[PDB]
Chains A and B, each alone.
With several copies, the nearest count.
Chain A
Amino acid sequence: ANILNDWYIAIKQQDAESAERYFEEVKPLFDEMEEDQEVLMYYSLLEERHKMLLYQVKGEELPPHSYFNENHTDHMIEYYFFLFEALYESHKRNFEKAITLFKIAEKKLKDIPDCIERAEFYSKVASMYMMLRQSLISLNYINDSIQIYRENEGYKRKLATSLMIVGQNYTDLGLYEKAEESFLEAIRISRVLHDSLFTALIHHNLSITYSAANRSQDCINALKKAIRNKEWRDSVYYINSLYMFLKELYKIGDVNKMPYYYKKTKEYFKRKENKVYEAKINIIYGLLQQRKSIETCRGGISYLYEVNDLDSVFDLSLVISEHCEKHGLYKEALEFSKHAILAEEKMRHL
């Protein structure tokens, strides 16, 4: 159980190398051996959390089997159960349930005095709220996490990750310079840490801020630095870079370089399945084809509504609308102009 707590400490530090060593060492201790049911639940909860960590930081695919698929009294194990399920629902874009599961965990957190645990909770709530572009709420939470992380040693990876949430929140607030500063500070931290995969990850996310600031060459240059890392290209997040490439290339009209990145998307999808980004890439590349283009865009937009990826609907509906406007297809331009409003209003409702 102390081993379990040490393992969770390593997860709370985003030390995937320690985390995987704890996971390998605790597995024999849990081979039909350990008897205490709350410890068995703790081990079952930490196994899920560890897989979410490996996905978050190493870009390793999440297992199809979750202990949360079918499991829904220590006041700690209950906080952990609600927090780790909020993360599972948050990743599935089931934000209604996630918000409820978070609020229950927040209530229990009143009885947990560990400062790192509190910073850990706030940083997960801030991440979900940022996914909804609830920027001020996310900042108030993450600002508490950063205060704690800066004053305690061993949480430099957590400070860096937190700064990326701040930067995106700033970008969602139109504060692109402050958003860049946050990502740059995160980049310095990761180079000090000598974590080149993390550095690639931060460059990819920074490219979102540059793109939102219409700093397209900086956006493309940041993506180039990310994709230079081999681990990044082998990760599930490679497709995110390829998609941002195509979209920024299309935005600036450098269509002659788009088939290059598009062909790499096919190689990604040959080995890894990602239906959200398949739809998103199909929408971007299909804009190069008129009526066929619109029918493909309607299918992709419809799938993104279905899986509740409203931020992508908002993003791509603006791009389709601009495309149709430029080609004199005003009825279709308005139709996707309206999808962008609908996606945004639905995102803010809850």
Chain B
Amino acid sequence: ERPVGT
């Protein structure tokens, strides 16, 4: 899963 908000 890739992080959000970057």
Direct contact of A and B (CB under 8 A): yes
Give the residues in chain A near B5, CB-CB below 8 Å. Answer: 56-57, 59, 161, 164, 198, 201-202, 205, 237
Give the residues in chain A near B2, CB-CB below 8 Å. Answer: 130-131, 168, 208, 311
Chain B residues touching A, majority SS: loop
What would 19 A/B residue contacts be, using CB atoms closer than 8 Å? A127-B6, A130-B6, A131-B2, A161-B6, A164-B6, A165-B3, A165-B6, A198-B5, A202-B5, A204-B3, A204-B4, A205-B3, A205-B4, A208-B2, A237-B4, A237-B5, A311-B1, A311-B2, A312-B1
Count of residues in A whose CB is under 8 Å from the partner chain: 24
Give the residues in chain A near B4, CB-CB below 8 Å. Answer: 59, 201, 204-205, 237, 240
The A/B interface has a contact count, at CB < 8 Å, of 43
Question: Hey, which bits of chain B sit against chain A, CB under 8 A?
Answer: 1-6
Chain A residues touching B, majority SS: helix
Q: A59-B5, A161-B6, A164-B3 are in contact. List 4 more A-B contacts (CB 8 A).
A: A130-B3, A208-B3, A237-B5, A312-B1
Interface flag for A244 (CB, 8 Å)? yes
Interface flag for A321 (CB, 8 Å)? no
Q: Which residue of B lies closest to A167 (CB)?
A: B3
Give the residues in chain A near B6, CB-CB below 8 Å. Answer: 56, 127, 130, 161, 164-165, 168
Q: Which residue of A lies closest to B1 (CB)?
A: A208
Q: Which residue of B lies closest to A197 (CB)?
A: B5
